[PDB]
Structures are given as C-alpha cells and as structure tokens.
C-alpha cells in the first residue's frame, strides 16, 4: 500500500541526441505514466491504464501546463547563466516534485530544484521552507517566499492537489501496480583464479523490492556478499545479481536465498 506521484523536469540550454530542450516525465509508484518533450509538444501516455481512463481534455490540460513550464524554464536558463556569471554552453535546470501516500494514510511532499548538477533550492519538510544552496539560490527563495505567493501555492499543491491526483491514479492502475511476477533465478559460476565465484541472478520480478542473499549451511554471509543495484527490464520488471567467493571444496554449502512478494516461501537456489 505505498503510493507516489512524481514529476521530473529537465531543461537544457544545449539539446543533444536523446536530450530534447525540455522533458517532463510523470511517474506513479516509480513507473512512467506520462511523457512530454519540447520536440513533440504533446503529452503521451506511457502505460495503458492512463490512456483508458483520461479523455482529451486531460491530455490538453496537462500539455498546456508543460508547454507553459517549458517556456518558463527557457527563461530560467538565461537568468541563471547570467546570475552565476557563466559562459554560454552546457547547462541543465532540473525539478523533481510530487507526493507520497503512506501505509498509515499520512502524506509526504517532495519539491527540489537543481542547476548544473548541484542543489539549487531544496524544500525542507521540518522548516516548511526552501533551503537555498548559495547566494544565487537565495534570490529565488526570496521571490517565491516573500515577494509573492508561489511557495504557499506549491505547499497547497503538494499537500492537496497532488494527493487528489495520486488517489485517482492508483485506482485506474490498481491491476498493473499490484500484479506479481516471479523471478527466474540462475546461479552461475564466473571465471577466477584459485577461487570459486558464484553469481546468483534473479530475472523478471515485480514489484521492485527484493532480498537476495547467500547462505552457507543456512547462515547468511552478508560480509562476503557483493550485490548489484536493482535495475529494470524493458517490460517493467526488474533484475538483480549477488556474488560470493568461496573455497572450491565448499561448493556444496552455498545457496542463494531470494525473498520476494511473488514467492510464497523464500526460494533457495544452488549452482
């Protein structure tokens, strides 16, 4: 029962292959559901359940918000280049925001801005205030918090409008988002010298959370286990690996343990 709505905006001064001038991607529970960029100038669905529940006026409505924000972010790039006294070139303005709906029905808000790869303004939940990273950011903090109402409008959006959208979205995507797919697990031997490396690979699982560990006669070997980060497949499932080096004559003692929402009991897998 955790749920999230998130928007990621990336605006560059220097478009490049695969990098339009402005891109806005929306995500529900970590899965893309809407996409906009400055080259198409339209918002496209990225999953079937949003295309089936939204009419034309929804797509027109979010599209004109993205087109307008695109326009504002082109001005931001000029403003910030001059403010930091930079030369024309490669520059990136980024915004990530949205809301979480937690187990206990409490909510959380995210609102953070980056410029040229560094923190610019970060909303701090305890201070109820944007943290400026530098004197450049302080100017914008003043514009938003003191010289106008923007900071309060964002607060309202994050705590109300965003949640209302999230509730709608989870109800249209309930089947896709709460599905389960089992990993195909294989333990492989990798090449090494005087040492036997075992590699446990779990393919195609959903949802994302997983525990993959190595046991020796039933005992976790956390100290000796290296594990990669969880990474996506093209179909919305995930992938992870974990390796351990062992004494060749101990081969029979090791099992890979996979605990996952799709598996009634944790699976044990052997070379």
């Amino acid at each position: 029962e955790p749920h999230s709505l998130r928007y990621f905006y990336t605006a560059v001064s220097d478009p490049s292959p695969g990098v339009p001038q402005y891109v806005a991607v929306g995500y529900v529970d970590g899965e893309a559901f809407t996409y906009y960029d400055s080259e198409t100038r339209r918002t496209e669905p990225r999953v079937d359940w949003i295309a089936a529940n939204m009419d034309q006026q929804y797509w027109d409505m979010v599209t004109e918000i993205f087109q307008n924000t695109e326009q504002i972010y082109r001005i931001n790039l000029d403003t910030l280049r001059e403010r930091y006294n930079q030369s024309r070139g490669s520059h990136t303005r980024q915004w990530m925001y949205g809301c979480d709906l937690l187990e206990d029905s409490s909510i959380r808000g995210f609102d953070q801005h980056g410029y040229d790869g560094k923190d610019f303004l970060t909303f701090d939940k305890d201070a109820m205030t944007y943290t400026a990273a530098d004197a450049g950011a302080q100017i914008t903090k003043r514009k938003w918090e003191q010289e106008g109402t923007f900071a309060e409008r964002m607060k309202f959006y994050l705590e109300n409008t965003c949640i209302e959208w999230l509730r709608k979205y989870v109800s249209y995507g309930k089947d896709v988002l709460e599905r389960r797919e089992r990993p195909e697990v294989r333990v492989s031997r990798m090449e090494a010298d005087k040492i036997l490396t075992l590699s446990c690979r779990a393919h195609g699982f959903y949802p994302r959370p997983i525990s993959i560990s190595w046991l020796k006669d039933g005992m976790v070997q956390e100290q000796e286990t290296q594990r990669g980060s969880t990474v996506p497949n093209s179909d919305g499932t995930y992938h992870v690996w974990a390796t351990i080096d062992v004494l060749p004559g101990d081969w029979d003692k090791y099992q890979c343990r996979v605990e996952h929402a799709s598996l009634p009991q944790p699976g044990l897998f052997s070379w």
Binding site: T69, I72, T79, L80, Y97, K143, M154, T161, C162
Partner: peptide, 9 residues
Amino acid sequence: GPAKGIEYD
C-alpha cells in the same frame, strides 16, 4: 496532474 502557475527563478 502537474503543478501550474510556475514562478520564474
């Protein structure tokens, strides 16, 4: 649905 009325930096 995204936030609207975005203010300039």
